[PDB]
Amino acid sequence: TRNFSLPQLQNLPIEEARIVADALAVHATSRQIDSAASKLAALAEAGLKGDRQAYAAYQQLLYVLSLSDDVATAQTRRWLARAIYRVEERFMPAADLSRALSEEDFQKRLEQEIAAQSRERHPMSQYVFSGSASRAQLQVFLRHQWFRTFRLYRDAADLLVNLTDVDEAAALARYLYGELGEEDEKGSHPRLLAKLLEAIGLEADFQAVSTMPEEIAYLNNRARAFRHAEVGWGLAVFYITELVVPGNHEKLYRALLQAGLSEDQAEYYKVHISLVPPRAKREWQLIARRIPDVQFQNAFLTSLSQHFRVERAYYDAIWEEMQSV
Amino acid sequence: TRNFSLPQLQNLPIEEARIVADALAVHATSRQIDSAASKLAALAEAGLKGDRQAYAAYQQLLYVLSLSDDVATAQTRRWLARAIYRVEERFMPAADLSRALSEEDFQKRLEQEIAAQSRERHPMSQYVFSGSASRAQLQVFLRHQWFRTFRLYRDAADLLVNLTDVDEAAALARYLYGELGEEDEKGSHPRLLAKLLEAIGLEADFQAVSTMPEEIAYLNNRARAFRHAEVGWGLAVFYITELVVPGNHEKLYRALLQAGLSEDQAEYYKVHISLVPPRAKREWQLIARRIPDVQFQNAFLTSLSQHFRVERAYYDAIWEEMQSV
Ligand SMILES: O=C(O)C[C@@H](SC/C=N/O)C(=O)O
Ligand SMILES: O=C(O)C[C@@H](SC/C=N\O)C(=O)O
Ligand SMILES: [Fe+3]
Ligand SMILES: [Fe+3]
């Protein structure tokens, strides 16, 4: 299977890929697993210090560890990913406020950060919204839309698991329920996107494996953020996504209709326009309750800044692919 | 913080509790974590061979590891819990099937197992249904009902996390949505039970920590099964609970109304009578697809039998406590 860990690892011409493979064996010893964790940590350190090959190598290995679908190795894979996450977060630039911002000041900082970094301001977004994109160019856009959308519900579920307050788990459960099609699994949002992809000649593969480095970096970061033990990381990515999807999707919907798509064909984008603003308003209380905590504020803001960095490098790479077709 | 891991460990007169504490430290080394794992596995092995003190020790530590609420230590706690689970599973009388049973023989064996040991036939259940229980004795019953209900949704979420198929994750999402109150979190099933609990004088403590050995055994086993990498373990526990809840809760509902509180206060039991039956028919498909796989059948039936042994010993202990008042 294409999105299992071991087939992906055999395809990486890296020695650490074989050490990781040994660490994921059914009878792997603690020493093999600690060896994998140390060599992964050193690879990530070398890559984050400026070694372009170690940088690419650890990002590919981290993609395999964090996002493969062979559930038998999942617990050890998540253990190994943590060895890499620890290194990454030491290199990330951390927000270090010592005193908590006011709730009003905090929301305004978010609004400002969004206005400065929103995916909606990217030249590619504006260009498609303009109607000037070719059909093959929309296909580039939707090919990568598939990778962003199709397993988002799993990252949300990792955050659900880490919210110990029953009311906060419930808010995330309502999100997951909406995201998985409510009472009809034929209408889960991954399948709505699949219906749109098929309307424009693309396959929606639930075992899709990305080969674009910036997309891998985006998916790796998002999973790390939603899985973090300090939920400020995950609430940052979750909530910024909830705030940006409605207007972005309203313009993407219009662009697809302009591009020769039906209302039903473009339903994936249509349903978020109306489903999200109410839910986003109720989900805000998860952030409001934690604002007095300066550790939460620093985790949230560091998460947000890191998310924006990888999202921008990713949109830039999609934009380049779109221009070459 | 009464149900966080470190405060619980400092209150355990078990030597290995200190080693576990060291393993959960912010900067714990691989040696300290691996050491803790080794001592926990040895303690479990001694306990399952008959050392009652080692048995009690491994069960209290496993309770702290698997069910404490400080998410900062959860990943390492779940890692250490695995070392105990592997030992436990070597001692479980597993259905040794060499080849897969037919669907016909699988459902028949399932029906037979449920017929022989369902919780509904336990003398305490028929006694409660009988009307004859005193208020103090119903308090005993509901005090332990709290421990079974108040974090069940978390165990189901771990199973959701391990269901890689999007339509099957959707099925578990429909379950969680219902269990956490659909659009209204004040109606989540833990809070409905908490309201039933407020009537009669009992506290519903979201940080409750059990000190009843058979109850610890029940919660430990259930979390292990729902977290297992082979989803047969969790599907076994999940499905046996969904199938028995409607009849059991129907009879408990009528008995509680006959004990003098309204239908609405006892809403926790009524809602299951109608809510669960339609969802159980769709949830069966997750099991039907896997019947042909003998590895699934062996996990499922081993889990069912282990769940019934632990459920029966727990119900026995509640019944003894109930008869002491
Ligand atoms: O990549 C991301 O995280 C943003 C997704 S949001 C789709 C679903 N929203 O509920 C996108 O590309 O639109
Ligand atoms: O874990 C158990 O023993 C089963 C629970 S069912 C609660 C289900 N939804 O609220 C019980 O004891 O009634
Ligand atoms: Fe969505
Ligand atoms: Fe329920």
Author numbering:
A (entry chain A), B (entry chain B): 3 to 327
The publication says:
FlcD, an HDO from the opportunistic pathogen Pseudomonas aeruginosa, catalyzes the excision of an oxime carbon in the biosynthesis of the copper-containing antibiotic fluopsin C. We show that FlcD is a dioxygenase that catalyzes a four-electron oxidation. FlcD is a homodimer in each structure. Each monomer contains two domains: an N-terminal superhelical linker domain (IPR037061) and a C-terminal iron-binding domain (IPR016084). In contrast to quintessential HDOs, our data indicate that FlcD employs a mononuclear iron cofactor to catalyze a four-electron oxidation.
Structures of FlcD bound to iron and substrate show that the oxime of the substrate coordinates to the mononuclear iron. The loop that contains V278 and R281 now folds into a continuous α3 helix and closes the active site alongside folding of the α2 helix, showing that substrate binding alone can induce conformational changes in FlcD without binding a second Fe. Surprisingly, upon substrate binding, the Cα of R281 moves 10.3 Å toward the active site to place the guanidino group within hydrogen-bonding distance to E244. In turn, E244, which corresponds to the glutamate that bridges Fe1 and Fe2 in SznF, forms two hydrogen bonds with R281 instead of binding the metallocofactor. Binding of the FlcD substrate and the subsequent relocation of R281 appear to sterically occlude another iron from binding to FlcD at a similar location to the Fe2 site of SznF. The positions of the iron-binding residues, E181, H191, and H274, in both monomers of the FlcD·Fe·substrate structure are nearly identical; however, the substrate exhibits two distinct binding modes. In monomer A, the oxime C=N–O of the substrate forms a complex with Fe and completes an octahedral geometry with two waters. In monomer B, the oxime N–O conforms around the Fe in a square pyramidal geometry with one water. In both monomers, the oxime moiety of the substrate coordinates the iron, while the succinate moiety interacts with the side chains of R121, Q147, R150, Y220, R224, and H251 in both monomers. Interestingly, the oxime of the FlcD substrate binds iron in two different conformations, although it is unclear which monomer represents the productive substrate-binding mode.
